Subunit: 267 residues, 4 copies
Amino acid sequence: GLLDGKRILVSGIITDSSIAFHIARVAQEQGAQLVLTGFDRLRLIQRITDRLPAKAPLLELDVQNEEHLASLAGRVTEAIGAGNKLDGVVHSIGFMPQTGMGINPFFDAPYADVSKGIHISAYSYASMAKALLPIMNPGGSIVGMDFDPSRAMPAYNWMTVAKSALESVNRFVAREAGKYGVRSNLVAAGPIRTLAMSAIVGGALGEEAGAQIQLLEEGWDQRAPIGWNMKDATPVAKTVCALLSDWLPATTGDIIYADGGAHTQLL
Amino acid sequence: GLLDGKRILVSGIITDSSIAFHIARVAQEQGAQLVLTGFDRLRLIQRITDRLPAKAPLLELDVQNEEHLASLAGRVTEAIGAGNKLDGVVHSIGFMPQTGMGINPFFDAPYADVSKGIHISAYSYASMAKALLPIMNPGGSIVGMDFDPSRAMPAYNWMTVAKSALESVNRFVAREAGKYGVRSNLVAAGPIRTLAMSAIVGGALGEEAGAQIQLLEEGWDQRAPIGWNMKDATPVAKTVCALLSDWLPATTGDIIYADGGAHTQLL
Amino acid sequence: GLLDGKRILVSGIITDSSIAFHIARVAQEQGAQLVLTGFDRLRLIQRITDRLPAKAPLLELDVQNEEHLASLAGRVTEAIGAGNKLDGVVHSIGFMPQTGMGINPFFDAPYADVSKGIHISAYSYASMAKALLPIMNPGGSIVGMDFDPSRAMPAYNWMTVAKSALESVNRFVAREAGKYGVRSNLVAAGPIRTLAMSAIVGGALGEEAGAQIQLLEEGWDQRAPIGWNMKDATPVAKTVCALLSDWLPATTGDIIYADGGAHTQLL
Amino acid sequence: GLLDGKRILVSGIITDSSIAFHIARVAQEQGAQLVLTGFDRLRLIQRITDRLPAKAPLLELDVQNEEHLASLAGRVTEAIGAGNKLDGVVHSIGFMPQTGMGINPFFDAPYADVSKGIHISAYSYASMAKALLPIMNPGGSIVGMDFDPSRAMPAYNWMTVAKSALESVNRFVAREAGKYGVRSNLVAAGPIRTLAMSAIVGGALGEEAGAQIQLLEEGWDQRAPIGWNMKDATPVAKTVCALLSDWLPATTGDIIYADGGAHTQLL
Ligand SMILES: NC(=O)c1ccc[n+]([C@@H]2O[C@H](COP(=O)([O-])OP(=O)(O)OC[C@H]3O[C@@H](n4cnc5c(N)ncnc54)[C@H](O)[C@@H]3O)[C@@H](O)[C@H]2O)c1
Ligand SMILES: NC(=O)c1ccc[n+]([C@@H]2O[C@H](COP(=O)([O-])OP(=O)(O)OC[C@H]3O[C@@H](n4cnc5c(N)ncnc54)[C@H](O)[C@@H]3O)[C@@H](O)[C@H]2O)c1
Ligand SMILES: NC(=O)c1ccc[n+]([C@@H]2O[C@H](COP(=O)([O-])OP(=O)(O)OC[C@H]3O[C@@H](n4cnc5c(N)ncnc54)[C@H](O)[C@@H]3O)[C@@H](O)[C@H]2O)c1
Ligand SMILES: NC(=O)c1ccc[n+]([C@@H]2O[C@H](COP(=O)([O-])OP(=O)(O)OC[C@H]3O[C@@H](n4cnc5c(N)ncnc54)[C@H](O)[C@@H]3O)[C@@H](O)[C@H]2O)c1
Ligand SMILES: Cc1cc(=O)c(C2CCN(c3ncccn3)CC2)c(C)[nH]1
Ligand SMILES: Cc1cc(=O)c(C2CCN(c3ncccn3)CC2)c(C)[nH]1
Ligand SMILES: Cc1cc(=O)c(C2CCN(c3ncccn3)CC2)c(C)[nH]1
Ligand SMILES: Cc1cc(=O)c(C2CCN(c3ncccn3)CC2)c(C)[nH]1
């Protein structure tokens, strides 16, 4: 397998439609030995991850909890065995309150909400690298999930700002990770029909936001030279595994686009 | 003058080396009628602004204070006279605690500090547009100050992340401002030897940060095809006035680089 | 006026819909003294330019003709008077054979055609700077016309490649121009309904290309936060004059977008 | 192996320091079955390729020769056997006359020289895709070599313009390749000490160009968070193989940076 013998931490599984579930599945199909991290609904996450090709220990991690982050390296070492280190880390964490995404006017998001979204979606990429770099092997890889925020778009609002902040955070994380012989990169995915994305299209964040995200999805497949299947997270999962492998050894502080090439096309 | 008859709000004056002081001076030399906003040290700001070519009313504005922002439009109207609106708005506000800039490791900035820096440096650009767009004329202009954060660099650390967030905020502010016939843009300046910049070079944020910012300054003038004089804020002030004028009427959600062309050159 | 006392060379007038006609008109309304250059149909160009606010000498310039370029500086000096130099230069020249644009497959453009298009559209920006920099004043400005080629699009085909080449040429021209205290920049305009653009929409380059350019035009106005009027070259002409003025003195090797902000927006 | 069962065409081998030699070697170590193309010195190329892990047929290809390109697909089919198609294509072709690179002033490159450089370095990427796409399998991959031309730099001059043109060509090739279920991408490598690069540093293109390329090399390793070894083409070769594999299936019309992350860092 592409990741045979590698010890990889995967955060971000919440449902069977989570991009992290598909990353975890493909990584296991490719011979990686995983450690999982889950937030708040641990009973649910264990039951979901019971469907993965192989059993993997599950650790609790709220990225807003400083105790969870301070104990994380020790908890991972206990799960993987003393003397072993991680070869890979996947950050597949993102959150923005409803005031910061959807039909709620961009000017009507209170800062406490925007700040919580930026903490979880951008700052935590640096918190996770700080916690795990001391237990990472040379030649290692840290990968985070991105949604191209180079241009403004309807409804994505403050989550776009959190992604722009995450891209900047990734470039600095690469400076730190480099001291450990570790790469840091983001995968900018095309839109994926997760449970939340389906709910948004169904009007969970207002009708106008639903209509706008449906047009974005259509335009994405139209612009993508190889097309874009929003119901298929496997091409995104494979790209994350390509970055976790030894096959992109000279790429760091960078962004790889697993979006069907849609960002390279105007129309 | 370039700005004859225009009513322009200018925030960000603190000392006679503030980029906003030079923006305010050039705007007045070009016939603009100004309203100033100042944070916390109002006695100091009044005394500084006494040196501007013309007298201008000074209003207090802490961008972290929701009462100041909610009353701002009314306070500006009282200063410019009922029935008059602003043609221009200058955001020249930036702040990052010492834990987020300098020699303090990038991983050692607490989130409360990073969040305060992002609130002042990025979110406030949207708070200011929300407050003032209802009192802005069609053909109007909102301009903010940027420092190119496209690539990571030493010491700038979390302030780089705040600038990346500000660039994203600007693109969304342009969507809102467009409804008012108003443009929103940033001026990405080359480094300017303000009081804080001189203090940093003098080691106020650690020796290594000082040495690194001195090398950045030297490299900037070297890369700039027309050179870069860090002791001269006038080219930056003129660029802000170009954006406040009627002469860039089809530019919005954008960034204009007043950096001597240094960002267009590798070496 | 914005350009009072300035001596500016303007190339690229062919009809009354030429972007250069509007640049020339606005520059004259702003007090500039112009010298014009025209290609091949000099009788037509003289008759067109008779409609400009003021009379301006017209010089012949085929950018593919080395004799025309070698004699250009001398011919300009004769027209503006010995001892006088130019403060500004406008390159508003572009051409691509029909095999390189439109419905003709991208793979079916012969290299002789692509090479002629790149010579006129990209290399000539450097030929013009070479010819005129020795007769340009410090503080001077060279401006060229661009169409954002960062992403591929239908029909534009090899002309997109010529624009990408022009952007690269501009960065090198800035290195040379800087030695003279001269700035070099491009204005990336939104689509303008020139005679050729109207002919393309009318199917002159095939039906599919017509339909595709009509969708691009519609999408441009939709994405532009301040809208985009393709029938109005005046905002583009004003942007070129802003770059020719003293008001963007720290910008070089760069691109200013006069596109209604459409490139900063995905949807 | 990463490329087990894949049929890959590799162009660009001339010496044992050619980036294409290392791409060919790594692809063979990973189980690919290769077809090679060589220009002009076929006896030399055969002798060089005798050192590759496995024997591979060698075909003559001058990308400026329309007969060579028109017969290429037939010649490849004869070498790989009727009924078999290629899964991958590597373009590792670049050339610029000495007038277009080095100490020769940027303004002193005759167009015939610049045009020959652009034909070989940029247009040929589309000529090669046109020739080989009809004999490529779905899921296939076309990869070209790039040197980041986003910013101007000393000596690279017109070759920088050819790379900017190549990036634009790649985005259009992706539109065509997508119809075949084929991806098209470039690998932007850091500087590699090939025979020509060593000759340049030794002053083959003038002393000033030598000094400037030595400073670029040093600055590259300094800026790269994981460092940059210019004497090691293996990380670049591995990146090309990552793109030729099934592990980046949603990336097209794009650029992957195998430069040690140096482009993501200012200093
Ligand atoms: N769905 C898309 O279209 C799309 C496209 C591009 C990128 N992404 C990104 O992919 C990543 C994964 O999102 P997804 O779409 O799979 O949705 P998801 O809901 O399945 O995953 C987001 C995860 O973040 C976790 N999380 C939230 N708050 C947390 C906290 N305080 N501490 C720790 N974990 C926390 C959630 O529990 C969840 O597992 C995110 O970064 C998202 O922004 C999504
Ligand atoms: N100095 C440089 O080299 C440089 C380069 C590019 C951009 N900039 C940017 O230019 C802008 C102005 O900075 P400067 O260099 O002139 O420094 P400065 O210290 O003179 O200006 C920053 C201003 O922000 C104000 N401010 C801080 N907290 C505030 C709050 N809560 N509410 C309202 N105002 C608040 C300060 O009072 C001050 O007037 C900033 O956005 C900065 O990031 C500076
Ligand atoms: N029309 C648009 O939508 C649009 C948008 C963005 C940029 N542009 C650019 O603006 C510029 C002007 O184009 P336009 O749209 O006004 O069309 P135009 O036809 O009016 O102008 C192009 C000019 O190039 C001149 N030219 C052609 N070959 C020449 C040669 N050998 N020597 C000298 N001059 C030569 C023509 O005579 C003509 O005056 C071009 O660079 C074009 O690519 C156009
Ligand atoms: N060396 C570096 O530092 C570096 C960095 C980034 C990218 N590159 C790129 O990598 C690629 C390979 O270059 P390299 O550095 O290995 O040098 P090289 O000299 O080994 O390879 C260039 C190849 O182009 C071939 N070529 C030239 N004219 C041709 C023609 N008419 N038809 C067919 N082939 C022709 C040559 O025979 C040679 O094999 C080029 O695209 C180059 O621009 C090089
Ligand atoms: C296209 C796209 C990009 C994204 O980044 C996301 C995020 C998914 C996780 N987040 C989230 N989830 C649940 C409640 C609140 N926030 C933040 C938005 C989506 C849904 N779509
Ligand atoms: C090159 C450069 C870019 C910048 O954005 C700044 C900011 C100036 C204002 N800030 C600030 N001032 C005082 C105390 C704390 N923070 C934040 C940094 C500087 C000093 N230099
Ligand atoms: C949107 C847009 C951008 C452009 O750059 C152009 C060019 C106009 C001048 N050219 C030209 N004119 C006449 C015959 C052949 N070529 C090249 C294309 C157009 C028409 N539209
Ligand atoms: C850093 C870098 C990037 C490049 O693209 C090249 C090319 C190598 C092949 N070329 C070439 N070779 C031999 C004679 C003439 N031209 C063009 C330049 C080099 C040498 N270095």
